Structure formats: structure tokens, C-alpha cells
């Protein structure tokens, strides 16, 4: 879950 | 041991230079964005896992984007300035029945910002304070989380005292907003999840992902 | 320039020595009483006009009183020591519906008060600083208060470092828990209203004028 | 209003 945060976290 | 106000006032500058709820939600989600590249300039918190990351960010992001947008409107007359260019005065969030919790945010946040001319610096370390949160539940590690947050409001206190020695209560008194800040970001929550529950009010990917159970 | 923190230990000393849910309640408007007498040994308290005191008192009740249980049980395993003389466990709160809201009191209040040894003095001193809430509602003159506010955490401020010199981050480390306190505090206010609503659940008399509007 | 709480502070 939390699709987007995770993302732009690992960016 | 590590935690320089320098760069924390480094991640402030860097990531900032009709219906009035509408445009609320709108700036918040703009925001998340920019809240995330935030986050990852302040010292230390790319290295806690990511699972941790998410836990502080997911807990935090309410309080952490109300006091960046109160501090920006501190040179506002009755209003707040959205990250968007957008200003939402004080009548126009009334006359959109927001006007109560509106008002908190003018008086219990802006305005004493404002009096005690609350700085840049100031504003990035409290928010780094809140940032760190150890009460956040989940947190695989919260020891390591609590001695973040120590060496933050330690290196505040060393910025405070220094740059302001002739106000010894400068220190506490930034610190003694943040009841406040927890209270008002509660609220604003609450509004949030009847603005999703009425079905009126447009909301954003990153804004809804944040709404998300739990 | 005139509170000292022995009076406010005083103050503290001189007000103490089935369904877990209703037994909460019957200790919370027990120690209503208790508390405006608490709150008259508060050095200039009294000396506010009555309307102003009243406002205090009705805006702070819930943390003040939360705040004065959790210390009391800081030598509980896991649970609660009531004003009444009795004890509720984590197992009995869980078993009545109220598990998370009880965990939260346990987690971020009674063990953070147990794992720094939080005195007398300090608890008195927290509490006269939520006490002196410039942020109510209502004040005649809320300056007043922010003054009286700051004359408490400045006495604070000087017991640690006088006492705990080899702790610098204590004072800051007793602020902090004032954000924990406001979110459970008004989480209990949240429960407080729906034992009210759904009728179950005694409530005396002036607990249940607290719950009054405002 | 607030009945108790005045009395309670008066006496
Ligand atoms: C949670 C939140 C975020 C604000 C983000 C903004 C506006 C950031 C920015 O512009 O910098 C604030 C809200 C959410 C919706 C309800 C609300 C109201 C009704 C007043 C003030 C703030 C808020
Ligand atoms: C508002 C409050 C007051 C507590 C007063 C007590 C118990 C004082 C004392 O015993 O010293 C705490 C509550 C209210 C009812 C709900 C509640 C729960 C479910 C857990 C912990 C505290 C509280």
C-alpha cells in the first residue's frame, strides 16, 4: 500500500 | 551529535522560495510532493529504513505542511497564502463554513508566529521535531527515532540563545506551539475526512493515498 | 519574577497523598473536585478574575487530570492507579472496548514519565503550564495568562540543569510530551461524549458539567 | 452556566 509515497521515497 | 541547523534551514529554502476548501486540498496534495524532497534534505532521515520513512511521513505530513503554510503567511493580513500563489482570506474561509477552524490556524499559529518573528531556521527545526515523531506507531526502531528528534531541539536551543541571547523563554516558547500544532492538524484531519465522505471537494492522488486506512 | 517551583510542588502534595469505563468516570469527577483546589494553590491562579479562572479550568481539566493519573502510575505493570484507590489493568480496558485509546495513555505518557523519572515538580510544573493555557478561549486578557505561563517554565527550566545538570535535554524532553498529552486528552474527550450519548456509563454530576457546551 | 466550577472557585 501507499503506492506514491513508497515511490517517491525510493527516487 | 550531527544535526546542523545549517542544513535544516538548507531543506526550508530549498523547497520553497472559488470554493476555499477546493484550493485548500489542491495545495495540500501539490505539497506531499515537495513535502517527501523536504524530508530527504534533512539529516538522517533517508537513512532510517524505509518503512520508517513512511511511518514518520504518513504520521506527520498534516502538522508538517500547516506550520510551513502559516509561517508563510505571517506577512498576510486575515489569510494564508497557498503554496499555489493562491491567498484565502479570512471571510472566505468563513463563508465556506470553515471559519472556526480557519481562525485557530490565524490565531493560534500565524499570529504568534508572527509576534515573536519566528525564523526560517526556527520553523525548519520545529518541523524536523515534528518529523521525528517516536510516538509514531509501527516505527521498527523508535530509540533511533527519539534521538533524532534530541539532537534537533538540542541544536534549536544552541541556535536559539545564540542568535537570541536577550530571550532566554525563546527556546520553550518555540517548542510550547507544537501543542497547538498536534490540536489544530486533529482538526483539519476530521475535515479532510468529511470532505471524502460528503463526496463533494475534488481530492488529489497523493492527499487520498494520505486518507488511507490505517 | 515570582513562581516558585516550591509552592507548585506543594500544590501537588497537597492534593494527593465493574466496567472499567464507569469506575473512570466516578474517579474523574472525584478528583474534579480536587482539582479546583489544586489549581487555587497555584501561585496568581486565584488572582484572576473568575471568569478567566473558570475558562482555564473547563479548557483544561481533561490533560490536567490525565496527567496527574498517568504519573500516579508509573509503579503499575500494565495499567492504571485511580484516584479511588483502584486499579485498572490493560486487559480490563481492552476487554471494555477502550484498548486503544488505554494503550496510547500507557505508551506515550505513564512509560516516557517512568523511563525519565519524572519528579513531582516537574509533573506540578507541566501541569501549571497546561493550566495557564493563553490559548483558551474566552480570556479577558490572555497576556496575562502567556505571562504567568512563562514564569512557570522559566522556574522549570532553572529546577532541571539544577538538579539534573547532567541532563541538558530534560527541560525540552518535558515539553514534549505536552503534544502527546493534548491528542490523548481530547481523544478521552471524544469517548467522554459517546459514553454520554449512548446513555450507558454513570456520569456524575460535575463531570458531566464539563461536558456542557461550550 | 458552569453551577459547580463557581461555587467550588468562590469558596
Ligand atoms: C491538512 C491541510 C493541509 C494544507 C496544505 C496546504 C494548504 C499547504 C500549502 O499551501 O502550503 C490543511 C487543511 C486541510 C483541509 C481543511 C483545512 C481548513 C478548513 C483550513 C486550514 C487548513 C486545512
Ligand atoms: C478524562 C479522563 C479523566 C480521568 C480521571 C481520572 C481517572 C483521575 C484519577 O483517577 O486520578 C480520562 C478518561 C475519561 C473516560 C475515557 C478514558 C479512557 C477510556 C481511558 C483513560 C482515560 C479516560
Known amino acids: ?11 | 551529535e550531527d544535526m546542523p541547523v545549517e542544513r535544516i534551514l538548507e531543506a526550508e529554502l530549498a523547497v520553497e522560495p472559488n470554493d476555499p476548501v477546493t484550493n485548500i486540498c489542491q495545495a495540500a496534495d501539490k505539497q506531499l510532493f515537495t513535502l517527501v524532497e523536504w524530508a530527504k534534505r534533512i539529516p538522517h532521515f533517508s537513512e532510517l529504513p524505509l518503512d520508517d520513512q513512511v511511518i514518520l511521513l504518513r504520521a506527520g505530513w498534516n502538522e508538517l505542511l500547516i506550520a510551513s503554510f502559516s509561517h508563510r503567511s505571517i506577512a498576510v493580513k486575515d489569510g494564508i497564502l497557498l503554496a499555489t500563489g493562491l491567498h484565502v482570506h479570512r471571510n472566505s474561509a468563513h463563508s465556506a463554513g470553515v471559519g472556526a477552524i480557519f481562525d485557530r490556524v490565524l490565531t493560534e499559529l500565524v499570529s504568534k508566529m508572527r509576534d515573536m518573528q519566528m525564523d526560517k531556521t526556527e520553523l525548519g527545526c520545529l518541523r524536523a521535531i515534528v518529523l521525528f515523531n517516536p510516538d509514531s506507531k509501527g516505527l521498527s526502531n523508535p530509540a533511533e527515532v527519539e534521538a533524532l528528534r534530541e539532537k534537533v531541539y538540542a541544536s534549536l536551543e544552541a541556535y536559539c540563545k545564540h542568535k537570541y541571547p536577550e530571550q532566554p523563554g525563546r527556546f520553550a516558547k518555540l517548542l510550547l506551539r507544537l501543542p497547538a500544532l498536534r490540536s489544530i492538524g486533529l482538526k483539519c484531519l476530521e475535515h479532510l475526512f468529511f470532505f471524502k465522505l460528503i463526496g463533494d471537494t475534488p481530492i488529489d492522488t497523493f492527499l487520498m493515498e494520505m486518507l488511507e486506512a490505517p
Do not use: E, M, S, V
Request: no cysteine.
Open chain 1, 1 to 11: 500500500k501507499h503506492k506514491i509515497l513508497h515511490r517517491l521515497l525510493q527516487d
